[model samples]
Target: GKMFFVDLSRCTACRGCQIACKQWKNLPAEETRNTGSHQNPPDLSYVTLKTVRFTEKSRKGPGIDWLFFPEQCRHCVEPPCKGQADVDLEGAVVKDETTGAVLFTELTAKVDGESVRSACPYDIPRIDPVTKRLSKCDMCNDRVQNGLLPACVKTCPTGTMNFGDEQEMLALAEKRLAEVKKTYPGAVLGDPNDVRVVYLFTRDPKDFYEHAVA
Candidate 1:
């Protein structure tokens, strides 16, 4: 299988990964309004499979701590999205046997989106307005199968994104967690065992984003 490790500490909220995902997928841009926060577009949409989340947390002192989390589908090992889809359409959502990537198929258009969305623990699925199909990250299956890195990981200038075989990523996640803990006692690897996309957080997972973990 494959895996992704996102080190939140190294991210600068550059949103480069976010942009790359759209460009690589040829996703159309949505009209966005400037919210009070630096985070634009508000939340993920049908066209936006990935986003760099900016969370402002209150600190002990005066200034607010802004945490950047580049969020995407976790591609769970036992994907509940697929479990729900199976009830409506067997092939609506399927997990790739080779890469362990959870993919929402065109058949998803036939399934109820609310049920699929409710089944997801990380709340990753979004319905396409026109197609009515469900959408989310597929780990760049075409690119990976041809030996190219996932667009987000390739575009990340910082050491925030890493993708590889399951074993390599798991080891890297553990190794980085130990090193990060020396400086940040609350450092953690989010849902490492349950999902293919794992995050290394410098603070509590909740401090990053509400759906930071399953």
Candidate 2:
């Protein structure tokens, strides 16, 4: 199975998806300070599985453009993090046979946090300071198993979040890219073959996030 695709061109940075993720997961809130940018909470946390990153770009002719990259787990097809976990404790990380979602189980407590963190190409997993367990997006397996869209996808007002079969998602990404290219010639899909969460960016992916693609 393939991953969901995010069309950056269509996202408005409204962050409805972010709120929905917290609500569905029943994650607690963390004390946060303003970072002077709309990108609130600053970075990912044990509770914050998804975050919309904001970047300000100023070009001579275009003035300034705000770019948003909704960051989360990439859920690699052959997840290196899983391999690392398996080396330490088998079944610590398991990739769902059906959705291809990489899940970090409580067994991850046995694996050194740094080992699992360094294994991911995208640098997604984080250790809970208190629990000492690895955590990241679970692909909303509970909802997906029940035939419901993930919280993030369901909350997006714009057609930015798309979930479907791998082949269908890739086809849609290509189709959207063709249309988006007319407006932003640099638009392209990021690491389409490497992971499950495909991202369509209107500019260089690096400008959006350090680990935008790998």
Candidate 3:
């Protein structure tokens, strides 16, 4: 399967990638809240699939720090949601055989949506409150299969979202990790062995965000 190497240091939280996901999916705009935070809406929904989070992190030897974690489904090497769904509903959740997406179908609406959510280690797979169908980052499989980058990757001006062959992305993830270690000293790739979407964080993964990894 393909992989994604997200370099979190370079992410500007510009929300361009965030916007692209909605535009590509044709999701309607949600009303915003001016809670003095750059993070809008504060939570994700079935329609607001890709979200860029803004948070403060404390460093070991410095003042307050910042973290911009672009949260999404890690699309585990073997997704538990599929195994969980298969027990009671065979086709509710399924993986793309040759790519990096674990998708939930209309069949998902017919199953116990809460059960499907519980199976996700990363706390992803938000069910549509109205439709009951589960949803999250599908890896924009259609775009990638067509020899194009996913919408989020396509619009990232700062090289934050990198995608390619498994080896290539893995190599990039490690290489970036080594480079960032010179500065942050604790930089590392997040769950490289278990997930298709590998995130490169420059601090304690927890420091970056609560759900930075699965």
Best model per lDDT: 1
Residue range 35-133, candidate 1, lDDT tens digits: 678786567888889878888878798898789988899989999999998999898988788988888889999999989999998988999888889
lDDT of 3 at 46: 79
lDDT of 3 by residue, 26-70 (tens): 987788878888887577777778777788866598676788888
CA-lDDT, candidates in order: 0.90, 0.89, 0.85
lDDT over C-alpha atoms for residue 74 of model 2? 88
> Any residue pairs clashing in model 3, and if so which?
none
RMSD of 1: 1.2
Candidate 2 residue lDDT tens string, 108-206: 888888989988878899888888888898998878878889999999999999998899999999999999999999998999988889999999999
Clashes of 2: 1
Measured against the true structure, the TM-scores of the candidates, in listed sequence, are 0.96, 0.97, 0.94
Which regions of candidate 1 fall more than 4 Å away from where they truly are? 61-63
Q: Which segments of model 3 are wrong by more than 4 Å?
A: 58-63
Model 2 CA deviation exceeding 4 Å by range:
none
lDDT preference between candidates 1 and 3, better one: 1
